[PDB]
Amino acid sequence: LGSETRRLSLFLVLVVLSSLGEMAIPFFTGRLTDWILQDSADTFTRNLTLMSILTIASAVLEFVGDGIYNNTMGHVHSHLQGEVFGAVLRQEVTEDTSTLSDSLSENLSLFLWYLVRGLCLLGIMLWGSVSLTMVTLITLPLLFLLPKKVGKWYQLLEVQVRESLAKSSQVAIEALSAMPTVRSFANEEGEAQKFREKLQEIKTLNQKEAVAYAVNSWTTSISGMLLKVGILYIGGQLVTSGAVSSGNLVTFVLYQMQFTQAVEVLLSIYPRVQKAVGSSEKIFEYLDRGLLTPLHLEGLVQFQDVSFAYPNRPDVLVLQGLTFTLRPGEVTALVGPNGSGKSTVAALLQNLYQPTGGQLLLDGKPLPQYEHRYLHRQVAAVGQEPQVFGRSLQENIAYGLTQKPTMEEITAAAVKSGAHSFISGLPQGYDTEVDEAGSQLSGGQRQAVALARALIRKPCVLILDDATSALDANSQLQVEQLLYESPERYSRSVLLITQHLSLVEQADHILFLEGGAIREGGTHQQLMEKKGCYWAMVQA
Amino acid sequence: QVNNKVLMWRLLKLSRPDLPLLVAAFFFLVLAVLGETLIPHYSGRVIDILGDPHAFASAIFFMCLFSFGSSLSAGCRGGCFTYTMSRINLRIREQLFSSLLRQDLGFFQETKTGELNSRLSSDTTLMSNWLPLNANVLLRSLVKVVGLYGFMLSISPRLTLLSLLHMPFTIAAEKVYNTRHQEVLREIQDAVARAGQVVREAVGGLQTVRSFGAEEHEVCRYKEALEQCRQLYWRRDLERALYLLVRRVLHLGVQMLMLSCGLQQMQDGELTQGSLLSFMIYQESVGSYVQTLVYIYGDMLSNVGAAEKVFSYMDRQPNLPSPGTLAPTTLQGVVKFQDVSFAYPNRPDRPVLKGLTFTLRPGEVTALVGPNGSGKSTVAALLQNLYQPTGGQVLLDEKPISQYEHCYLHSQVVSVGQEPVLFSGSVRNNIAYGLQSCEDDKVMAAAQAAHADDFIQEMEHGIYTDVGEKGSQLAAGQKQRLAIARALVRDPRVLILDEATSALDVQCEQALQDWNSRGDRTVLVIAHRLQTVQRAHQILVLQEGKLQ
Amino acid sequence: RRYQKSTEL
């Protein structure tokens, strides 16, 4: 908020000037009264011109100040929301800030305007007549106590009624969301009875709400009438005494009315400001809670005493002294216990988390030293849970790309992944937009889209896993055939964590891990024709 | 159109039982308006008298009496109207909810729950403000205006012509401003919803975004949405201030034209000082009512539209068949399927069943196996009179199932759902769901039939505890055994199991398939594997909608 | 800008 410290200051000037310009209609009015009892037109014309000029200037200044304040507040709100969302996304609520900012800004503006007005009115009244101002100040608190007491009770009753209505609403939505069971058990009358019993409780509160409303209205009217009468009596007696004229009394009466209105507005506005200020601290607290240049990688990776764990604590490690290694141009697969959590190794390959020990340098360079922008487009692959975003298919199949690929390149990537048929069969070509969060997607289509998104970037390492698990048997066979038929076995490194032994049959060197480290391995034919884990799994 | 008149007549008829309250409200409103109209006249006469104690005292007393009476009526009317509003709201909600329960299952399969919640929570309140709020303010506001202008014409037949000429320049401006605001608000709402959709999409696909490191693009898209919304916010904030400036300038001008003309008329000799004061008060006061009348008349149409939208749901006709009446005393339990074919109305002309035919017997425990695209669920559902078969017929004891009473049928035949659903009531209320009355002895007997007592009996007070919302505190296996106990508490004659053994114990399934509720009562079990073969007396496979 | 009063029921 500091960066806009100048503009706001300008606003804080203009309002003050406006608050002095609008106090010319009452004052001169009294002057006109003092003119009508002492009957030239020169003074009348002078008063008229002064009043008109001051009022016009006040209106213009108020307009300009309001424009400046709104323009600044819009930018502040947008910047705050952007920062909040960025922090939330990188951390791994949003609508709360959006619904809070407008209310906070509006209430703060009204509070400032009416506070300045009230200060100016009190000052001019005090300069006018000290005794009447003292009387008004003395009698203000005594006549502004009971209405607040009644209003708090009325507000409590209103909020109770609204909460009861919300409870009944759910009592109804829950019933209506499970219609097949209700119809099956023939229990519609029970639901109707429950709803009626819920409404019979609000029927009781509504009467007291109405009574409180009526009493509050009566109290407000009585206080409003009493306040004015109390000062009118003393003003009349003072005027009759002859110490002051009638015009001064008229100006004081108008000033007192405006001052009371300003005080009442301020009292009505303040609680909302307090609530919004208290609420913004929660958002604040929630928000407040360099690499070497890479050129090319040959696909050679290896690990020595590598360890990784969950972010919750380093004691949830799923690896201990691993020795995984995949040769460039060779495709290999890994196996292990279901509860061992070996899948995190794939995340370790994507540089999502730094190693807890040892090193995981690949292609002769440290793993976390390369640039993040170029590494993510050369070491990633299809995810474990295929999905399609709400963007266009031509953009969904190339998400996270610095430069949008050409139509021919996209078609070639889809064909290499088998997704060309899906693109051709989709209506309106690649310009069609897929449903948000895969609302209308299919397992085979999702697998094809994931494979295309993986292969579009020409990765130097493959971390494809669980893609065929969601895909069909025919799609899995096609993916395996494409992987096996790539030029010179794709001439790159693949470390796929396959779910079926059909893909692991042609593995260059299969391996299985236990206890956080690789415990067995070798050729697939040797593993399946010996005491290895693969043969035991096949026989079992 | 005449549709608005029809809706207005329906809304009038909905408030028929509120005559004793509306009469008092419309009496107090008239009293308050008549009291508030006459005060400035007596103020002016007092001012004229000051410039004879009897007349002064009379005027002061009358002014005080009118002020007090108006103050009282202005609160009595508000209380009465608030009570009337509340009554109308509570009356309409019950009718809306009780009309929806009779609809067919396709209506709920099609309509999103968000629309139902919106109708039952928001529009039923908007349509309830029509009579107590809009038709009240409009009436008093218009009447007050008529009275003020009558008094102004009485005081001075010449000065009122200027206000009569000035009024259109205010009416047109207010109309234009309201028209612009009503569309700016909805544009802002649409922009906000579109902005929130981006965050929702980012949340939905978080794993892929973190895997590819594409946060720096989602942030940019969100910033673009925010920058698109900020412009609409600024436009609205500018229009409001421009309107305020125009209003302030116009009023000062009118007052100065009024003040100058009034003074020039008084110095001639055709007017007095109190008369000028009263005329100034009236002319100052008329404008606020003139503006609020336009505001309220513009606002009433939204309530009328909301009422139309609510009434369009409770007037729709259902698709249930003709109600039945038959209710025999002892059902034999023989069920036959004859050339049954079915197509979902939501996705028509894509049949799931093609001439299915089979026969069931009391002791013949028949098992259905085969995936058929999960079509085993459809044959189970239509055996409970939940859907009507488009071809063939299904009959119970040589009579169609649709000919039996709705209340009677679901006592003899009951099925367990594939995914059990539990309600937020107590344990006893869930077991005895749908029954008129039950005894705790039966609940223990029903619970012991499913071995669920091993969990229920550790819990304090036994069966009177509150189950978590939609069974939140229960485990997947625990919910299965609770749903089973909900069936044998009813003593069924025909039993249908939707692969309960997939989560429940196989031995428990055998006991449920061989107890008194299954010794001579027809049992049909659905299995995803050959596990049902160990007891099935008539195994039946069906694929592509055709039986094996 | 100036405070706007809610319409009295």
Residue numbers in the entry:
A (entry chain A): 180 to 218, 220 to 272, 288 to 484, 492 to 742
B (entry chain B): 131 to 181, 185 to 681
C (entry chain C): 1 to 9
Q: What text comes from the article?
A:
Peptides destined for display are first delivered into the endoplasmic reticulum (ER) by the transporter associated with antigen processing (TAP). TAP is a heteromeric ATP-binding cassette (ABC) transporter comprising two subunits, TAP1 and TAP2. Each subunit has an N-terminal transmembrane domain (TMD0) that interacts with other components of the larger peptide-loading complex, a six-transmembrane helical domain (TMD) that forms the translocation pathway, and a nucleotide-binding domain (NBD) that hydrolyzes ATP. In this study, we analyzed the structure of TAP in the presence and absence of peptides. These structures show that TAP suspends peptides across its transmembrane cavity, anchoring their termini in two distal binding pockets primarily through their backbone atoms.
The biochemical properties of the recombinant protein were assessed using the 9-mer peptide sequence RRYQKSTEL (b27), a well-characterized substrate transported by TAP and presented by HLA-B27 (25, 40). ATP hydrolysis was stimulated in a dose-dependent manner by b27, but not by N or C termini–modified b27, consistent with previous studies. To understand how TAP recognizes peptide antigens, we analyzed the structures of TAP in complex with b27 and two other 9-mer peptides, all of which have optimal lengths for binding. These three peptides, b27, ILKEPVHGV (a2), and QYDDAVYKL (c4), are natural products of the antigen processing pathway and are presented by HLA-B27, HLA-A2, and HLA-C4, respectively. In contrast, the b27-bound structure exhibits a different TMD configuration with a lateral opening. In contrast, structures obtained with the b27 (9-mer) and b27″ (7-mer) peptides have a lateral opening between the transmembrane (TM) helices that connects the translocation pathway to the membrane. Although this gap could provide access to the ER lumen for bound peptides, it is blocked by densities representing putative lipid molecules in both structures. Nevertheless, the peptides are suspended in a central cavity surrounded by TMs 2-6 from both TAP1 and TAP2 in all three structures. Despite their sequence diversity, the three 9-mer peptides are stabilized in the peptide-binding pocket by a common set of interactions involving backbone atoms on each end of the peptide. Furthermore, TAP2 L377 forms van der Waals interactions with the N terminus of all three peptides, and R373 interacts with the main chain atoms of a2 and c4 but not b27.
